[PDB]
């Protein structure tokens, strides 16, 4: 029913926030160590695939969210949550999955940074247009803006230092990379135990038919439609995979923050667990596709 414990005190969620921040820092450092700048500039030379993929994602994801909201008879708050979470730009999870499938990594990072930069302006545009009848207010000032630029800095700076280190001192990369890995492991366990401290009652939030169906389709719809549109426009196999997997994934932090700021906690009680569930589903799909992909290259 109501929020478990008291969210006002915020006992340990600061620790969860800082652990996630440091994990993103380490991941972006490793990713920057992975890639090279010349191929990034080459991708900037012909953004045709990148531009069409990005505009296709921003055109299909909000429309798919609106269609799901119309079909599954979600309430106003849940429909707004679907609309906001669906049209969010690509997060670091897509970059980690790109590590998993090791396909055209710098294209993935350029796509995610361009998606964030353009979403900074498209959030009011997409929210004002696609939310007629839900939240009659304009909500053009409730979209986070400091958070988006903070995320942009946190995704560019470690990549910048990694790409500078690799392009000038290529002999010390793997070593520090290995160190990052073990640190990740430690941070990883912290995450889960801290999630326990904030596990609450996620079963109460889960309304099986509508929520489960929306979660099942939306990342799957993104993956499938991105793959199909990449295949249609004559894209490379690595490009196809990375584009499909970037469009399928999204970001959940801004969705949660805007939901918190727009509505009082009592109205959005269970919805506080929606983004987390969203995350715990997309990964549950992501790795699964990887498990298929290896088989696709085994034969």
């Amino acid at each position, epitope marked *: 029913f109501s929020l478990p414990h008291n969210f006002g005190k915020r006992p340990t969620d600061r620790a969860l926030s800082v652990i996630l921040v440091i994990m993103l820092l380490t991941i972006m450092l490793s990713l920057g160590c992975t890639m090279e700048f010349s191929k990034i500039k080459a991708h900037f030379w012909r953004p045709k695939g990148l531009a069409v993929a990005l505009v296709a994602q921003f055109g299909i994801m909000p429309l798919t969210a609106f269609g799901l909201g119309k079909f599954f008879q979600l309430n106003n*708050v849940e429909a707004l949550a679907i609309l906001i979470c669906g049209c969010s730009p690509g997060g670091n999870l897509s970059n980690v999955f790109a590590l998993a499938i090791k396909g055209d990594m710098n294209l993935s990072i350029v796509m995610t940074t361009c998606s964030t930069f353009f979403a900074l302006g498209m959030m009011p545009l997409l929210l004002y247009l696609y939310s007629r009848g*839900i939240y009659d207010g304009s909500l053009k000032d*409730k979209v986070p803006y400091g958070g988006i630029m903070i995320s942009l800095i946190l995704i560019l700076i470690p990549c910048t230092i990694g790409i500078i280190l690799k392009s000038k001192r290529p002999q010390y990369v793997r070593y520090v990379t290995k160190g990052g890995i073990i640190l990740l492991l430690l941070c990883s366990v912290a995450v889960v135990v801290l999630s326990a401290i904030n596990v609450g009652k996620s079963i109460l939030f889960v309304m099986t038919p509508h929520l489960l169906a929306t979660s099942s389709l939306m990342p799957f719809i993104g993956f499938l439609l991105g793959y199909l549109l990449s295949a249609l426009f004559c894209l490379n196999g690595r490009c196809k995979r990375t584009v499909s997997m970037e469009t399928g994934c999204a970001n959940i932090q801004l969705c949660s923050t805007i939901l918190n700021v727009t509505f009082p906690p009592e109205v959005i009680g269970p919805l506080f667990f929606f983004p987390l569930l969203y995350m715990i589903f997309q990964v549950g799909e992501g790795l699964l596709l990887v498990a298929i992909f290896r088989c696709y290259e085994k034969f």
Partner: antibody
Amino acid sequence: EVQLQQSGPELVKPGASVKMSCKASGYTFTSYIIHWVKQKPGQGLEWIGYINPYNDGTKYNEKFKGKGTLTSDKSSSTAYMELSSLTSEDSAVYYCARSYYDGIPHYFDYWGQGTTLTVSS
Amino acid sequence: DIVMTQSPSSLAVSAGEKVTMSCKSSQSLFNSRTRRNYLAWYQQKPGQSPKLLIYWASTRESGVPDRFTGSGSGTDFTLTISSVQAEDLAVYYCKQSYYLLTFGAGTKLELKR
């Protein structure tokens, strides 16, 4: 149960600058929004606008956009209305109503006692 | 905007004859996403604050008499009473909240002679 308290009857000269206070202590103030309804004597109800005390979000009707001004106070759990432009025809009964607001105001499930305002010399 | 009009605006029923208040609104104020049919039927006794009777144009607040009942969809709505009595003489407005909060003209109930 929840009840709404109004300031009471008020007489004011046509020089305007009048204030109305509606207090609500029966529930969590920020969870519900407060609408203001105007009723001239014998001409039916008329909506003015609502205020969300959580984010202080005020929405006004087109007719009352120029005159109406809605504010809220969390510490006192109250809502204030100011008009700052009164004529001899503005004498009417004003009600503050509480409505649930998920994304769209549902209905006025509880009303205030209503305060009568008169403008004359 | 949306404007609503109530047709009779005046009725006279003595003891048991059922009443029928209908306001046809202007546009289809029915939500396609959810079958809520945003509409509220209120009651205004003289010298008193309005009291809510029906919400979603089909359901009633707990505690109201069961004689009141409202049925409608799209733009056609109708409030009826199985048996009217002395304290049923009031004014009804059928407010809507689909797009903007607008009230109807109002229907007055009297006692016949």
